Structure 1
Amino acid sequence: IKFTKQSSVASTRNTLKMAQDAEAGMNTLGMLGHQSEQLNVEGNLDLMKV
């Protein structure tokens, strides 16, 4: 039972850690805002239509 609890603590440590790691979702979203502004290209395209 002490061994099992030690294994559980080790795995919860790893779990929190990987959760933090995924929390990459920020670099993705921030850059998606960046490229969203870049696609807002649309301004140039409208001007070409005129």
Structure 2
Amino acid sequence: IKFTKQSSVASTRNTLKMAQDAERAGMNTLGMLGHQSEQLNNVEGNLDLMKV
């Protein structure tokens, strides 16, 4: 019973760690997508001016 509990504790530790790391991965992805959104807004503006 004690061993199984220890295994559960270790597994929850790993789960929390690598979950937090996934949080990071998605976060920097979103900041990055906002950056590229701004860049594409510039692209769109240049294309409009070019149409005129």
TM-score bracket for this pair, using the shorter chain length: over 0.9
Q: Which runs of 4+ in 1 moved over 4 A?
A: none
Percent of aligned positions that are identical? 100
- Residue-pair matches, total: 50
Unaligned runs of 5+ in 1: none
Aligned to 1:43, which of 23, 27, 45? 45
Question: Over the residues paired in the alignment, what is the CA RMSD in angstroms?
Answer: 0.7
Q: CA deviation at 1:9?
A: 0.1
TM superposition score normalised by structure 1: 0.97
TM superposition score normalised by structure 2: 0.93
Q: How far apart, in 2, do the equivalents of 1:26 and 1:33 lie? A: 11
